[PDB]
A paper describes a structure:
ADP-ribosylation is a reversible post-translational modification involved in various cellular activities. Removal of ADP-ribosylation requires (ADP-ribosyl)hydrolases, with macrodomain enzymes being a major family in this category. Crystal structures of several proteins in this class provide insights into arginine specificity and a shared mode of ADP-ribose interaction distinct from previously characterized macrodomains.
We therefore resorted to MavL-UbVME covalent adduct, which we managed to crystallize and solve its structure to 2.19 Å. Mutagenesis on this loop showed that F105 and E107 play important roles in MavL activity. Additionally, the MavL-UbVME covalent complex exhibited similar catalytic activity compared to MavL, suggesting that this UbVME adduct may not represent an active-like conformation in solution.
Residue numbers in the entry:
A (entry chain A): 42 to 409
B (entry chain C): 1 to 75
């Protein structure tokens, strides 16, 4: 139903964390400790995949990483945060509308079939002390472009490799839409300066790895505001900057960019995710407010995660829980309630990108 | 009348109030001593969250009762 991905460097951090735990030199944060305590293996007896999955499983359906976390043992530690922010997840989806926020969405007459790749942006905001990503990419409070570049390369490249391959298998090319990842709430104090840094990071990644992405065709980047319209040729790829508030008629995130169609391309949308939440985050509580929540509400994300068969409400642009559930449990019946009543957890297959650019099992990449 | 307001960090605030003070007045008084905007304050007592428009006397909050302050998440 879904696939967790992470970089080689993230795997190294995981191996180091697991070993620190095994030695007694680190201890888990509260939420990871809860997941550990509900199963039977010691850290040492568990394989690297199982350990990684349990850490990912400590995510909660909705969390505001930018304001609600303390970065210590009472929720997730910095060491866990550094790892969780690097974890991405993809899934095939049905796209019921174009992804328009609020009331502006346009239903697809025929729902589109495509894919989402949830990726968390650089966490540069906090309600308490500094975040792991602040410590990573800020030099005394100033954004470092190369360091930001390396962060996003770590977090996006495994998904590009995956979909490059998936396009080849379907004998098509990939059309990928990207929102202003990390330029919203995650940018905190850097709101007014972050957008050219994110754009530069996307360009740098595609440029550095053009040789490994021959089946990627179109990258449609839409930070909404604060960037100029542009198309760049990056090798064989066409990178477009089309902020919707600047360029009238810009195609939605959940729709084929100009020059692509379902016969020639698979459609992938990157979703601005969150270190600590399940995919879709605040739509688990029924809110439809961020890129994360809007795209989950506009797709069958919730059915991919829970296995349930929801129903798309054309009038409000929301994929609803099963109708039997809403009748039986009206009043405590959002998707997060469905999760509680059904004992659903977030845990699925995980692969790592190795030094050569192949996605393999954590065990296989660790031993190389 | 004095009442106390305990925060998450266990810190304890002392307030000077009247039984007829509304929970809204109390939140305003919390803003005066602590600078927390009232629309970020949840006040808990006797297992409930308290409504702005009712009085301390309505909720049976007596002298030296302790209210619990929880801040609002905000995305
Ligand atoms: N929920 C976080 C929102 C922060 C914000 O408004 O960034 C612009």
């Amino acid at each position: 139903a879904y696939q967790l991905l992470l970089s080689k460097e993230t795997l190294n951090k995981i191996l180091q964390y697991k070993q620190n735990l095994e030695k007694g030199l680190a201890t888990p944060g509260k939420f990871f400790l809860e997941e550990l305590s509900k199963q039977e293996k010691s850290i040492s007896e568990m394989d690297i995949t199982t350990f990684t999955q349990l850490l990912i499983q400590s995510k909660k359906p909705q969390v505001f990483a930018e304001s609600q976390v303390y970065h210590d043992g009472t929720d997730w530690t910095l060491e866990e945060e550094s790892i969780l922010g690097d974890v991405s997840v993809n899934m095939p989806v049905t796209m019921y509308n174009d992804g328009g926020h609020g009331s502006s969405f346009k239903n697809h007459p025929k729902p589109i079939s495509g894919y989402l790749a949830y990726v968390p942006g650089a966490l540069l905001a906090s309600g308490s002390g500094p975040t792991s990503d602040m410590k990573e990419v800020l030099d005394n409070g100033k954004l470092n472009q190369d360091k930001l570049n390396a962060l996003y390369e770590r977090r996006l490249l495994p998904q590009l490799i995956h979909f490059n391959e998936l396009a080849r298998q379907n004998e098509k090319q990939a059309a990928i839409t990207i929102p202003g990842i990390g330029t919203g709430c995650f940018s905190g104090a850097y709101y007014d300066v972050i957008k050219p840094y994110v754009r530069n990071a996307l360009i740098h990644i595609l440029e550095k790895h053009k040789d490994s992405l021959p089946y990627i065709d179109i990258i449609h980047y839409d930070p909404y505001m604060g960037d100029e319209p542009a198309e760049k040729k990056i090798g064989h790829m066409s990178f477009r900057v089309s902020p919707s508030g600047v360029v009238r008629g810009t195609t939605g995130q959940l729709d084929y960019p100009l020059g692509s169609n379902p016969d020639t391309h698979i459609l992938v949308s990157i979703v601005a995710w969150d270190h600590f939440s399940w995919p879709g985050n605040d739509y688990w509580g029924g809110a439809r407010q961020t890129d994360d929540g809007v795209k989950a509400a506009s797709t069958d994300t919730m059915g991919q995660v829970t296995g349930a068969t929801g129903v798309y409400d054309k009038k409000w642009g929301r994929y609803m829980p099963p109708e039997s559930f809403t009748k039986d449990r009206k009043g405590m019946s959002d998707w997060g309630d469905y999760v509680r009543e059904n004992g659903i957890v977030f845990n699925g297959p995980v692969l790592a990108l190795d030094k050569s650019g192949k996605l393999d099992t954590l065990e296989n990449v660790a031993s190389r | 009348m004095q009442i106390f307001v305990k925060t998450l960090t266990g810190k304890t605030i002392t307030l000077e109030v009247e039984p007829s003070d509304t929970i809204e007045n109390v939140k305003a008084k919390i803003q005066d001593k602590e600078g927390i905007p009232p629309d970020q304050q949840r006040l808990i007592f006797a297992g409930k969250q308290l409504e702005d428009g009712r009085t301390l006397s309505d909720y049976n909050i007596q002298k030296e009762s302790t209210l619990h302050l929880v801040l609002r998440l905000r995305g």
